[PDB]
Amino acid sequence: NPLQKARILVNQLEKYLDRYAKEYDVEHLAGPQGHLVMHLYKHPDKDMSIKDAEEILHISKSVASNLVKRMEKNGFIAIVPSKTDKRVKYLYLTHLGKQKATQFEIFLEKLHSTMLAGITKEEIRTTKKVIRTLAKNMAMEDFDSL
Amino acid sequence: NPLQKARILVNQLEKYLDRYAKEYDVEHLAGPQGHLVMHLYKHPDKDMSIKDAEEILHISKSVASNLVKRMEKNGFIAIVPSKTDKRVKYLYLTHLGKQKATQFEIFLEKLHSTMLAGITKEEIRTTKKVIRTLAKNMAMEDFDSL
Numbered sequence A, B: 001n002p003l004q005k006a007r008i009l010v011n012q013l014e015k016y017l018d019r020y021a022k023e024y025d026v027e028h029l030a031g032p033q034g035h036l037v038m039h040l041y042k043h044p045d046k047d048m049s050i051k052d053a054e055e056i057l058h059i060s061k062s063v064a065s066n067l068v069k070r071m072e073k074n075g076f077i078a079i080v081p082s083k084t085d086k087r088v089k090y091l092y093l094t095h096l097g098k099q100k101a102t103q104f105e106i107f108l109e110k111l112h113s114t115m116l117a118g119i120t121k122e123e124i125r126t127t128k129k130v131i132r133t134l135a136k137n138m139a140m141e142d143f144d145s146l
């Protein structure tokens, strides 16, 4: 069975990703936390309220609320209410969050360099075409994926 | 995150496989049951004891014992002790098991025809090369997979 063969692989690869992240001290920056950190970092001119965060990650209000409170717990951001309207919550990347941001870019660079060692942009493009076609063949009517 | 993107896909594909199997009435023949049925079917000259079954699927004694008792429950096989030594258990495919065997070959034919529609042997070979390389890159020392 290739199903079970495939699941087991992704799980093992997730294991590797996680250890790699520990090693770079950019744990907890795997998924959505890292996305918000890199958003904040790259656009310091602009602000992000929690409402902006929901839209930027396409997540629900309660989920967003849990995320940012986790990020705050981690010390990556400060949550400061709009001085003009204290129902609006702004997120600001801390010193620690900016450190994590620069660490995260490094990590992502080395991770891809390691993972994609010995593999061409062509090979990848093929890979993507195959997966997407499979997905198409099997889903039929249900083809509403990523 | 491609991890979560990838897991979700395989899960959805498993969903499709399962419904396809129901439709062909070859449910429960997904994995190891189907392998033993097709082994029995293709080699009627030879016999398979439960001990042979363990070796043919590389599974433990207790696991094998559960499998074949499930297969018996399903009506796919008869479990009959060696007439000469009643500690040896032989498996025999029933009429229903032979029907399932011929159904299973059909199913597998149509499944691949559907899934691999619009995809070349080349594309596949590339796919396999990429996956295996990824696996190699990330596992390092731990490269002892399928």
Ligand code: HEM
Pocket: A017, A029, A030, A031, A108, A112, A115, A116, A124, B001, B002, B003, B134
């Ligand atoms: C936390 C995990 C990961 C994150 C956050 C992530 C994020 C990214 C980002 C932002 C890019 C865009 C690169 C660019 O052109 O600047 C990228 C590209 C890519 N990623 Fe990942 N990635 C992750 C894990 C993986 C994994 C596990 C794989 C495969 C196993 C993978 C394969 C790729 C490939 C093939 C590209 C395309 C390179 C290109 O077009 O230049 N990534 N990833």
Ligand code: HEM
Pocket: A001, A002, A003, A134, B017, B029, B030, B031, B108, B112, B115, B116, B124
């Ligand atoms: C219960 C599920 C499945 C079983 C039991 C199964 C079994 C098999 C077997 C026996 C073959 C050998 C074909 C031959 O040359 O005679 C095969 C080939 C193949 N299978 Fe599957 N398969 C399953 C599901 C899948 C899935 C889900 C995929 C991909 C999504 C897949 C992709 C392939 C490919 C690409 C080949 C190679 C064709 C060739 O070399 O001629 N299979 N499978």
